[PDB]
């Protein structure tokens with residue numbers, strides 16, 4: 001698992017469950033092309049998006065459908081989604097955890113990069 | 116003024132109005148002594164807590180009554196308050212803005228230090 | 231003004247000065263069209279992006295060039311930028327403050343919506 | 346494990362390792378009495394602070410020594426520490442994760458409450 005996504009809910013104090021997540025990689029004509037997707041589990045985690053072989057250096061976008069999440073809970077949200085855009089670099093072996101903390105009118109995102 | 120507190124509500128996307136704020140200063144005997152207090156305004160800001168003459172070097176505590184805020188909106192929050200503890204003016208007089216962003220189960224705090 | 235952007239540096243405890251900000255609006259053909267741009271001031275604020283006449287209903291994107299900011303301070307950051315995407319003015323004209331708090335491997339964004 | 350603490354570093358994009366954490370419970374004379382402590386592991390986590398039998402309803406404080414952490418990395422910090430103060434309540438079976446995201450001049454904390 002070179003890439004994992006974890007989503008938390010700051011209103012309820014819980015994992016954010018069944019949140020749709022899409023991953024894109026930047027193409028040479030500088031358009032975004034779909035790469036991987038899924039929904040967060042009961043622990044708010046999304047595992048198995050990609051493999052070591054496929055996850056090469058490049059520019060990636062992780063888009064989290066926060067609007068549909070808040071809509072399901074009956075709470076008015078501000079953002080259309082949360083986008084996280086980064087360059088993946090080989091130095092040594094790497095694992096990426098993209099964590100997002102969600103509120104209706106705010107979100108925070110951090111990258112935890114290990115190995 | 117040397118010390119200002121600004122509080123935001125991450126659920127409503129608004130200033131957090133009428134929030135109680137209590138400031139304490141550490142004495143020589145290592146106890147917390149009452150220093151200043153007030154309520155946030157319509158803009159979520161609290162000005163005029165202290166003066167340049169009064170705000171000497173020391174360790175200060177700013178305690179924001181987040182629990183009473185959430186409860187008056189019908190929400191039972193996780194935290195009792197948001198507490199910020201810091202050493203002030205140790206390389207000379209500065210101006211401090213203490214900002215807090217509030218959610219029922221989470222908060223962030225930042226300091227902007229100038230001059 | 232209808233739209234203001236404020237950027238803070240969580241490492242230095244200061245406004246984030248000279249930060250590039252680009253605003254886009256979604257067209258009928260679903261592409262992003264350039265709307266407005268500017269640089270944050272000494273206070274980390276960007277005022278005067280648009281007017282009440284120009285800032286109609288739609289989906290907007292605010293892209294903050296966080297990478298160039300960190301690089302000029304000698305830090306190689308994780309994210310390419312901080313991107314905020316939202317529907318504006320759909321229940322009538324409002325005033326929007328978009329705040330971003332920056333760290334090399336993390337950022338938070340909040341909206342304060344009034345009037 | 347009814348109570349776990351997890352600490353992240355927003356400057357380096359990593360677990361915050363070897364951070365001292367102290368837990369207190371509020372006594373009837375309203376003084377803070379030490380309860381449990383330890384240091385975060387290589388994954389930034391602190392497990393085994395207490396047991397189901399000992400962790401009764403009450404008011405608790407978790408104090409994270411953020412200042413010593415930043416000092417070890419050679420970076421000037423603002424806060425003396427991060428304090429998280431909450432009421433533990435029995436409803437159904439509960440697990441508490443107190444997560445903290447650290448920057449030199451800012452911190453965020455969230456509670457993830459499960460089972």
Ligand SMILES: O=c1c(-c2ccc(O)cc2)coc2cc(O)cc(O)c12
Pocket residue numbers: 121123212214215216223224225227236238329330331338339340
């Ligand atoms: O710090 C903030 C924040 C802010 C943003 C993100 C956070 O995590 C915390 C506070 C929001 O609006 C402001 C508005 C201000 O006028 C001054 C500020 O310092 C802030």
Ligand SMILES: O=c1c(-c2ccc(O)cc2)coc2cc(O)cc(O)c12
Pocket residue numbers: 006008099100101108109110351353442444445446453454455457
């Ligand atoms: O809460 C977080 C955060 C996190 C993210 C943003 C914040 O503002 C605060 C914490 C990051 O990684 C985690 C990773 C975890 O396994 C559990 C968590 O609760 C978190």
